[PDB]
Scaffold this active site. Structure first.
Site, short mmCIF file in Angstrom:
data_model
loop_
_atom_site.label_atom_id
_atom_site.label_comp_id
_atom_site.label_asym_id
_atom_site.label_seq_id
_atom_site.Cartn_x
_atom_site.Cartn_y
_atom_site.Cartn_z
N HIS B 73 67.16 19.07 55.18
CA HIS B 73 67.75 19.91 54.13
C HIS B 73 67.32 21.36 54.32
O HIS B 73 66.56 21.94 53.54
CB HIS B 73 67.37 19.37 52.76
CG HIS B 73 68.16 18.18 52.34
ND1 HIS B 73 67.62 16.92 52.23
CD2 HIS B 73 69.47 18.05 52.01
CE1 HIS B 73 68.56 16.07 51.85
NE2 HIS B 73 69.69 16.73 51.71
N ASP B 231 79.10 17.23 53.04
CA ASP B 231 77.66 16.99 52.92
C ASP B 231 77.27 15.67 53.57
O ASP B 231 76.17 15.54 54.12
CB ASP B 231 77.24 17.00 51.45
CG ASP B 231 75.74 17.14 51.27
OD1 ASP B 231 75.18 16.50 50.35
OD2 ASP B 231 75.13 17.89 52.05
N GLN B 282 71.34 3.41 59.18
CA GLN B 282 72.62 4.04 59.47
C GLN B 282 73.77 3.07 59.24
O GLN B 282 74.84 3.47 58.76
CB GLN B 282 72.63 4.55 60.91
CG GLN B 282 71.74 5.77 61.10
CD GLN B 282 71.92 6.78 59.99
OE1 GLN B 282 72.99 7.36 59.83
NE2 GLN B 282 70.87 6.99 59.21
N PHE B 285 74.07 2.81 55.43
CA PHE B 285 74.54 4.10 54.93
C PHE B 285 76.02 4.29 55.22
O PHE B 285 76.78 4.76 54.35
CB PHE B 285 73.70 5.21 55.56
CG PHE B 285 74.03 6.60 55.07
CD1 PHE B 285 73.99 6.90 53.72
CD2 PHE B 285 74.33 7.60 55.98
CE1 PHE B 285 74.27 8.18 53.28
CE2 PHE B 285 74.61 8.88 55.55
CZ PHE B 285 74.58 9.18 54.20
O1 LIG Z 1 72.48 5.16 46.43
C1 LIG Z 1 72.32 5.54 47.60
C2 LIG Z 1 71.95 6.90 47.93
C3 LIG Z 1 71.78 7.30 49.21
C4 LIG Z 1 71.39 8.64 49.66
C5 LIG Z 1 70.69 9.50 48.83
C6 LIG Z 1 70.22 10.71 49.31
C7 LIG Z 1 70.45 11.08 50.63
O2 LIG Z 1 69.97 12.27 51.08
C8 LIG Z 1 71.16 10.23 51.50
C9 LIG Z 1 71.36 10.52 52.95
C10 LIG Z 1 71.84 11.76 53.39
O3 LIG Z 1 72.09 12.74 52.49
C11 LIG Z 1 72.06 12.02 54.73
C12 LIG Z 1 71.81 11.04 55.68
O4 LIG Z 1 72.05 11.32 56.99
C13 LIG Z 1 71.33 9.77 55.29
C14 LIG Z 1 71.07 8.70 56.25
O5 LIG Z 1 71.24 8.83 57.47
C15 LIG Z 1 70.60 7.46 55.68
C16 LIG Z 1 70.41 7.31 54.34
C17 LIG Z 1 69.99 6.09 53.65
C18 LIG Z 1 70.20 4.84 54.21
C19 LIG Z 1 69.86 3.68 53.53
C20 LIG Z 1 69.29 3.77 52.27
O6 LIG Z 1 68.96 2.64 51.58
C21 LIG Z 1 69.06 5.01 51.70
C22 LIG Z 1 69.40 6.16 52.38
O7 LIG Z 1 70.65 8.33 53.47
C23 LIG Z 1 71.11 9.55 53.93
C24 LIG Z 1 71.64 9.02 50.98
O8 LIG Z 1 71.94 6.44 50.26
C25 LIG Z 1 72.28 5.13 50.04
C26 LIG Z 1 72.41 4.33 51.16
C27 LIG Z 1 72.75 2.99 50.98
O9 LIG Z 1 72.86 2.18 52.08
C28 LIG Z 1 72.96 2.47 49.72
C29 LIG Z 1 72.83 3.28 48.60
O10 LIG Z 1 73.06 2.75 47.38
C30 LIG Z 1 72.49 4.64 48.74
MG LIG Z 2 71.77 18.36 48.01
ZN LIG Z 3 73.32 18.62 51.33
#
Ligand SMILES: O=c1cc(-c2ccc(O)c(-c3c(O)cc(O)c4c(=O)cc(-c5ccc(O)cc5)oc34)c2)oc2cc(O)cc(O)c12
Ligand SMILES: [Mg+2]
Ligand SMILES: [Zn+2]
Ligand SMILES: O=c1cc(-c2ccc(O)c(-c3c(O)cc(O)c4c(=O)cc(-c5ccc(O)cc5)oc34)c2)oc2cc(O)cc(O)c12
Ligand SMILES: [Mg+2]
Ligand SMILES: [Zn+2]
Lengths: 326, 323
Positions: B73, B231, B282, B285
């Site tokens: 970020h 995003d 991944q 996600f």
């Molecule tokens: O509620 C959820 C929120 C988010 C969430 C929140 C802030 C976040 O910042 C990102 C984010 C992002 O903004 C950018 C990314 O590249 C990722 C990523 O590669 C992997 C994940 C990730 C994977 C599995 C998880 O259990 C949690 C996170 O997140 C990335 C994702 O991811 C989920 C991933 C899921 O598989 C299931 C979810 O319910 C969610």
């Molecule tokens: Mg943000």
């Molecule tokens: Zn962002």
């Protein structure tokens, strides 16, 4: 002193609609919030139930009251003390007996105490339109109400001010969220959606025998507490006329002083804020007819018949203000 | 080196821009040079009488308030979202749908949407009783803060790039930018996606084949989902960009779990470097968040975003075949 003797007997009315809150304000030395909250905490046995050291409570209330602007005519520590005490009465009502836990009760009273703390005496729209630091911080959304919450919680971190120190982890979190949902609901830009859901709940209300009200989830506990504190904040026209009129004088002086701040910057003068084209009596009738009475009627149905006297006073006061219009 | 940077910046209208090279070649100024290039490309300096020195001055002040010690970020992520939003705005299915002001709001919102991000989640800021969660009452703590910072820096010396917008223009842009950035809160993702699915199933096109949007509610909602898609656009990018983004977000998550460990708090999902699988993260996600979102966006602008959706599914099957 006879000075403290009278404040103590004035404080015996703490369970009554129409508490002499302005004389309590004078007798306490302009500490109505501290003495009224202390009394209410003594009355509801909350210090013992939550292990609040009395000097921690007093220290917090004094600090909290310090952050209400005494030079603001309406949104000051007297209004907070009034909303506190009004919520306190609306909680002792028969149709809500033992419907709310000791913690939820603590949320309603605490939220009422902080629901306007550090109010600058100007509205959200003013703060937005003047590009104020507050509107910039909060992105124009419930600017005052977010600020009241932020200060009310922040003051707990001052020396010997954490009245929640002996609450458990989850209790602090649940209290925090409930206070947030309550104070954010005092924003008048949410009144219509707040009132609609109160009507919806009234259309499908379920009660025992004796007339106690049944709520089940959290999305109905909090909205009743939301509308309750919203009602207590909009309870001035339901108080005895002598009280209502002193609140009316104060809200008009605060509105007018905003209108002067507006006129001197060459801004649009908000509704009610121009002292040169005001109609105080007609405004109170419209405010009752369109806002206060629909709210309190809906509250009266939800708690039938416990709020009849309150509703009766409101319609007496409406009829009176209409009669002052020639 | 200024010749090579200028040549990479010719790809500003392309998905898969080498944003990390541009970060290097610009002296860690990807947000400034990519914003400047897009404003030139869209002729926004002349449309809104934005003086060039004012633009550069704000952009470098804004870019400074992104943290260079946060792996994901940071200012590179902001430049990436800016440029991805720039491409999404140019899609044929949206030709002449949005006004110059809405284009300005979407790009500006993308620029400030993560400014001053500390590298930790909203939930972490709430559970650690942070001053930010205290200020914002636990609701969209980061997102409200990004907005406050982004608008605040317009007040610095020669930084108000909106100084020659009319007052209603400023008022309209401010509300749109707030609505867009607040929609980047992932807690809003499901409702934002449900609205986008509703819009796709009730979709309307003009005489031309261009998306039809009567009202503010529909227009701001498309822009919200657009910036939200930008995003969440790492897994739709060419794999060599995607992987670098994945390495960065994993390291940022692991650092959050390392602070969660230094406090005995329950470690957040995907933040435990001793129990984390990047491949499974991944796949989940993509399967639960990114592919549902991008498949729905691809439906809205069909077939404009087919190559983006194809790249995302290829990157999905790269994980599928290698886990
Ligand atoms: O509620 C959820 C929120 C988010 C969430 C929140 C802030 C976040 O910042 C990102 C984010 C992002 O903004 C950018 C990314 O590249 C990722 C990523 O590669 C992997 C994940 C990730 C994977 C599995 C998880 O259990 C949690 C996170 O997140 C990335 C994702 O991811 C989920 C991933 C899921 O598989 C299931 C979810 O319910 C969610
Ligand atoms: Mg943000
Ligand atoms: Zn962002
Ligand atoms: O829809 C309405 C909303 C409101 C409204 C909105 C924000 C508001 O903030 C307050 C408010 C409030 O929050 C607190 C108050 O004490 C008043 C008041 O005394 C008088 C008025 C008022 C009276 C006449 C007007 O034409 C306008 C305002 O408002 C107070 C009220 O007032 C109405 C007053 C009316 O006469 C008719 C209305 O439809 C409305
Ligand atoms: Mg208030
Ligand atoms: Zn109030």
């Amino acid at each position: 002193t006879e000075q403290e003797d009278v404040l103590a007997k004035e404080l015996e009315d703490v369970n009554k609609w129409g508490l002499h809150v302005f004389r309590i304000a004078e007798l306490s030395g302009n500490r109505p919030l501290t003495v009224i909250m202390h009394t209410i905490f003594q009355e509801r046995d909350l210090l013992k139930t939550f292990k609040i050291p009395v000097d921690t409570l007093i220290t917090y209330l004094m600090t909290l009251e310090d952050h209400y602007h005494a030079d603001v005519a309406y949104h000051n520590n007297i209004h907070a003390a009034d909303v506190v005490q009004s919520t306190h009465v609306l909680l002792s009502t028969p149709a809500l007996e033992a419907v709310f836990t000791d913690l939820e009760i603590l949320a309603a009273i605490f939220a009422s105490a902080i629901h306007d703390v550090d109010h600058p005496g100007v509205s959200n729209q003013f703060l937005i339109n003047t590009n104020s630091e507050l509107a910039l911080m909060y992105n124009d959304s419930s600017v005052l109400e977010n600020h009241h919450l932020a200060v009310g919680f922040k003051l707990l971190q001052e020396e010997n001010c954490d009245i929640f120190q002996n609450l458990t982890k989850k209790q602090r979190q649940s209290l925090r969220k409930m206070v947030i949902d309550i104070v954010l609901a005092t924003d008048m830009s949410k009144h219509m959606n707040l009132l609609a859901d109160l009507k919806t709940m009234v259309e499908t209300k379920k009660v025992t025998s004796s007339g106690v009200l049944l709520l089940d989830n959290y999305s109905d506990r909090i909205q009743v507490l939301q509308n309750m504190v919203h009602c207590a904040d909009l309870s001035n026209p339901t108080k005895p006329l002598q009280l209502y009129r002193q609140w009316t004088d104060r809200i008009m002086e605060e509105f007018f002083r905003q209108g002067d701040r507006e006129r001197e910057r060459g801004m649009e003068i908000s509704p009610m804020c121009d002292k040169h084209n005001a109609s105080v009596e007609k405004s109170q009738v419209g405010f009752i007819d369109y806002i206060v009475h629909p709210l309190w009627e809906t509250w009266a149905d939800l708690v039938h018949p416990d709020a009849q006297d309150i509703l009766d006073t409101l319609e007496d006061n409406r009829e009176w203000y209409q009669s002052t219009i020639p």
